[PDB]
Design an enzyme around this catalytic site. Structure first.
Site, PDB file in Angstrom:
ATOM      1  N   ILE A  88     -52.907   9.622  28.174  1.00  0.00           N
ATOM      2  CA  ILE A  88     -52.118  10.683  28.343  1.00  0.00           C
ATOM      3  C   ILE A  88     -51.051   9.905  29.138  1.00  0.00           C
ATOM      4  CG2 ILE A  88     -51.670  12.964  29.292  1.00  0.00           C
ATOM      5  CD1 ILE A  88     -53.940  13.262  27.635  1.00  0.00           C
ATOM      6  N   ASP A 111     -54.404  17.773  32.017  1.00  0.00           N
ATOM      7  CA  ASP A 111     -54.407  17.005  30.846  1.00  0.00           C
ATOM      8  C   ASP A 111     -55.144  17.513  29.872  1.00  0.00           C
ATOM      9  OD1 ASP A 111     -54.550  13.883  32.790  1.00  0.00           O
ATOM     10  OD2 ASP A 111     -52.964  14.893  31.816  1.00  0.00           O
ATOM     11  N   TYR A 124     -50.253  17.876  36.314  1.00  0.00           N
ATOM     12  CA  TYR A 124     -50.610  17.348  34.934  1.00  0.00           C
ATOM     13  C   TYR A 124     -51.970  18.172  34.581  1.00  0.00           C
ATOM     14  CZ  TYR A 124     -46.438  15.070  35.615  1.00  0.00           C
ATOM     15  OH  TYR A 124     -45.275  14.723  35.826  1.00  0.00           O
ATOM     16  N   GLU A 182     -53.041  21.772  29.207  1.00  0.00           N
ATOM     17  CA  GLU A 182     -51.695  21.482  28.852  1.00  0.00           C
ATOM     18  C   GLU A 182     -51.336  20.637  27.513  1.00  0.00           C
ATOM     19  OE1 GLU A 182     -49.824  20.800  32.324  1.00  0.00           O
ATOM     20  OE2 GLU A 182     -49.118  22.790  32.737  1.00  0.00           O
ATOM     21  N   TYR A 213     -51.802   7.284  32.060  1.00  0.00           N
ATOM     22  CA  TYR A 213     -53.254   7.557  32.494  1.00  0.00           C
ATOM     23  C   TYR A 213     -54.135   7.376  31.145  1.00  0.00           C
TER      24      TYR A 213
END
Ligand SMILES: [Cu+2]
Ligand SMILES: [Cu+2]
Ligand code: NA
Ligand code: NA
Lengths: 620, 620
Positions: free
Chosen positions: B371, B290, B288, B293, B374
């Site tokens: 996110i 964060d 990911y 993306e 998280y």
């Protein structure tokens, strides 16, 4: 009732009385060290025996003694004459610190050196510095201090601004003789002052800082009972104090549900050394063992409220012995308070709609000490989530020299003509572990990288490995930051609900260890400082990584001799000794008074608990 | 007046208006990214040109556009059609996050998989996860999200407790088709709940925490002007906000006497990636980005007073664009406050009789973002003594899987049957340096050990060396904790009073970098994460270490392509990119909600000032 209570004034005067009655403390005797001994293993069943250990110096030149006294029973348990040439000289006495300057002031060689530099002897301060062990055969068995000179232009001047380079003297503080005066040549004495309270240097003080007020309107969340037993947010410990080690934590435990779970039996800074990296003969012998040679506890500052310690502070005022065995209180020498530590845990969940935030806090236990130019804060922290941390704060005034014309590979420039020799500050934390009790072991944990191939076709996998340190000969370990190396202390007989041994992981900062050549005198005297992690089997006489007597003591004792016993540490009562330090190349910003720099370590629970231990912390 | 002011609601509606007027924002268009551009170098002389950069997605399947707009002039500066198979897909849209679950809920393969596990489709949440680039040729040029399933027993249940392992699906969010459903076999869905507000799990909440009150009765010591210009204790900066990077600091400078001395022109977290280390095909594609993306700025939390941010807080409420170009305020999205930071400097001098103590403080600028599972806090700190620091606080709920029968080398156990795949969180800080202006260079500084011998007869000497990084090809550096490696950014044309170039030293934490095999897809897409320090020559189009378009974008862009230009960085306008991260092997204590862990870096003045910059701090 607690056998871990601080020494009282009464107990020290009683030790004095017992020693006197026994013929061990006549008018030529001086106490160089005095402290309470920890209770023996399994002694909780027996009634209290408060025992004190004492090193007695003799100002007439007779051999010193190590003495153990039972203050409960009014008896001398043991008394033994020391041979200091063999086992080491006693710690420097506070009363010896003036003696180097005083003797030098009427020595014709010293006076000749000062006259060559046009320096008024009445203005020359002499730092009384530990001597170590080098090539001077006449020093063996003698109490020696070495003197470096600094000019003080007026009573309130900072002498550190005016080092007298090219000059060093050696003095026998018992016979009161100057053994050597070495003059390698004149260097300019740096002229600029370093008076950080003089308005000419500070300029107008800032008027831009608005107050910050920290209060606890219901008082603090911790309790103190029995003088020094702390209970705070599930933690339980006893705050001890020793004149050598300073603040010592005992019986660190955490109340998990109804069960009081031990974690660490005893935590202390068992040594600290400041080795200097300037090859000039004026300073190449300089290595200050502040703990072992000087006794950092004895120079603990009285900490002023709203100033050294901010918030709702609870103080302890530990009592120590003066040179004659009379009690002396260090008023407000230990600060204890709790403080907010930001966010503990936070999640805003899309699917549940639940937003959750909780705040962290830590209990702080600290003291600050001053050893000549240096001042160090020692901070222990306990966190809500079961983390334990130590931090050392280094400040004071940097130790100075001349800055050589044409520069230096081993000294930096601070001001015109003013140098600061490179050096390290290296600590040893002694952690007598008790993870859920005494049956413990240590594993070294490294990250393991994996190769792309069968079983890992996308080349994304990574793992870790643990290696049990089974015997002391395999338990001298170095850092490896690149592989994320840590060390886990676990109890192989105590398992969490997932059937894994409970444990704690030690996270080091991976700063450089001792830089000196491995064949040097300092590498031998401070062997502990050459490796990041040592593990020993517990023994009651293995207290310091440098042994009991560090002053003018060669190698022979301490950690390298302890581990030679090659004892079983795989599920046994063990002690972890962690070396950690700062490597200091002084900058202009460190002058004329150094902003705090820090170093430390921490240990975090690693499957110790069955889930987060802070689920029961309330909102707001 | 400041060209560094935050975007206003007005400016965003005006961008919307200009795009509409120009035919670029019809009803099928969606804004995937919108942010203000920094002013060009040397543009202070010219009048303001507020320019905005916009990535426009098209829901009907037409090619997206990159567009630059002048909101001052009401014009489109440039508009270009993107070929996403080549340069990358646009960032994931907030509106696409529900789409993976919604499409899967009527797909017969997905329904078959859920029925094999006796799971009610109405209770199955699907995480919409970035896809990366692997072996699936049909995905190239298509906007794909992958879905992993988690069961939610009731509306307020934490789905993370109930991962559905053995199952993953891939979805085209534009054509709204399910491309693949992979079922590798059933795993038990972990049954225990992870509801950290349920009294059955928390037990009775603690009643032992007494309040801590932090107030500033005269208000804060910092000022805010022009919406986002901060002045505090000699520091000067502008606090920016971007939907991708989050909080961005501009024009960090320090007022030294009468002169405003630049230090850093722009500081940001320019990327963050979370690579997973579980080789199961269910998760081996998971990485990911964060920042790149998802755009961490856009998920910034509204921070509640006395709760997320404690003390006397000043908030900024940054404005961003929704998918249609309408302004959206993130109320209380940025916290700003000052806090006490213990002792700044302390010395008790024997010779002068002067006792001196001063307190430290830091300015804090932060935000928190969420996110999925998280949550991360991003903290910037400015200290009285000229130190600048960043800290990331990682919390939330750990990403889960099944725990395999017989264990795992790549997953840890959290609860019965519940696993947590190993992973890293790795950040890139982009520091557009301006040490006393733009003419800068970087040296790598190592400690140098010296051998006992001539010139060093006691074997105590140690030193250091500095190596200038002269060109970009020599400026990709790794950590070396054992040698105390740091990096100094200096200005070779600006000298302090001791005739040395002024500078700042970057101190890294030396945590492990990216662990993945160097031949993996992630090592190529996150090449920046394989090395600790990169230095480039400044260019206005080199913004992110991963390039502009990270989503489903192979290697080709970002840092490795920037440095191939092999440009001069020896006394030029340069940018330092520091990689730093956490390597996480989840512990039982991380479940069911993770206590904060931290990572970061700092830069400290290194001969920048002519002496301590905090001599003028008052007592008490
Ligand atoms: Cu130092
Ligand atoms: Cu993690
Ligand atoms: Na032990
Ligand atoms: Na720059």
């Amino acid at each position: 009732a607690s056998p871990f209570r601080l020494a009282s004034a009464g107990e020290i005067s009683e030790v004095q009385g017992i020693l006197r009655t026994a013929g061990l403390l006549g008018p030529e005797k001086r106490i160089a060290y005095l402290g309470v001994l920890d209770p023996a293993r399994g002694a909780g069943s027996e009634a209290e025996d408060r025992r004190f250990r004492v090193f007695i110096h003799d100002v007439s030149g007779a051999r010193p003694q190590e003495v153990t006294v039972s203050v409960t029973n009014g008896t001398v348990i043991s008394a033994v004459e020391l041979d200091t040439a063999a086992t080491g000289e006693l710690p420097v006495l506070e009363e010896e610190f003036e003696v180097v300057e005083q003797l030098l002031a009427t020595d014709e060689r010293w006076l000749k050196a000062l006259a060559a530099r046009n320096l008024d002897v009445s203005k020359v301060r002499v730092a009384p510095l530990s001597a170590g062990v080098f090539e001077y055969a006449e020093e063996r068995g003698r109490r020696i201090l070495r003197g470096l000179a600094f000019v003080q232009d007026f009573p309130e001047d900072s002498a550190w601004a005016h080092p007298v380079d090219g000059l060093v003297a050696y003095v026998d503080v018992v016979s009161k003789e100057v053994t050597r005066v070495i003059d390698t040549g004149v260097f300019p004495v740096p002229a600029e002052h370093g008076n950080y309270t003089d308005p000419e240097l500070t300029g107008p003080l800032r008027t831009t800082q608005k107050p910050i007020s920290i209060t606890q309107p219901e008082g603090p969340s911790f309790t103190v009972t029995g003088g020094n037993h702390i209970e705070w947010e599930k933690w339980s410990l006893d705050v001890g104090f020793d004149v050598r080690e300073g603040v010592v934590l005992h019986n660190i435990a955490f109340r998990d549900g109804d069960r009081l779970r031990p974690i660490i039996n005893r935590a202390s800074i068992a040594e600290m050394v400041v080795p200097y990296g300037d090859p000039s003969p004026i300073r190449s012998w300089q290595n200050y063992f502040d703990t072992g040679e000087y006794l950092v506890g004895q120079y603990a500052n009285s900490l002023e409220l709203g100033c050294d310690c901010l918030g709702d502070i609870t103080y302890l005022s530990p009592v120590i012995s003066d040179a004659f065995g009379n009690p002396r209180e260090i008023r407000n020498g230990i600060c204890m308070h709790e403080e907010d530590w930001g966010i503990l845990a936070k999640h805003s969940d899309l699917w549940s709609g639940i937003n959750y935030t909780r705040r962290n806090r830590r209990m702080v236990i600290s003291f600050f000490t001053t050893i000549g130019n240096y001042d160090y804060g020692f901070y222990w922290y306990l966190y809500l989530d079961g983390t334990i941390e130590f931090e050392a704060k280094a400040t004071g005034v940097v130790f100075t020299s001349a800055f050589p014309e044409g520069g230096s590979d081993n000294i930096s420039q601070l001001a015109p003509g003013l140098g600061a020799p490179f050096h390290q500050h290296i600590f040893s934390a002694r952690l007598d572990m008790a993870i859920d009790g005494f049956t413990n072991r240590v594993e070294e944990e490294d990250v393991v990288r994996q190769t792309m191939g069968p079983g890992n076709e996308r080349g994304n996998a990574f793992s870790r490995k643990r290696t049990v340190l089974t015997r002391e000969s395999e338990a001298v370990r170095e850092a490896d930051a690149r592989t994320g190396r840590t060390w886990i202390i676990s109890n192989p007989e105590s398992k969490n609900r997932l059937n894994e041994p409970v444990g704690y992981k030690l996270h080091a900062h991976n700063q450089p260890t001792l830089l000196a050549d491995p064949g040097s005198s300092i590498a031998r005297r401070a062997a502990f400082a050459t490796k990041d992690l040592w593990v020993t089997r517990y023994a009651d006489d293995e207290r310091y990584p440098t042994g009991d007597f560090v002053n003018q003591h060669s190698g022979g004792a301490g950690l390298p001799s302890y581990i030679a016993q090659d004892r079983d540490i795989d599920g046994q009562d063990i002690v972890v000794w962690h070396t950690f330090g700062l490597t200091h190349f002084p900058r202009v910003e460190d002058w004329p008074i150094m902003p705090v720099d820090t170093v430390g370590f921490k240990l975090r629970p690693e499957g110790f608990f069955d889930r987060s231990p802070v689920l029961d912390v309330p909102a707001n």
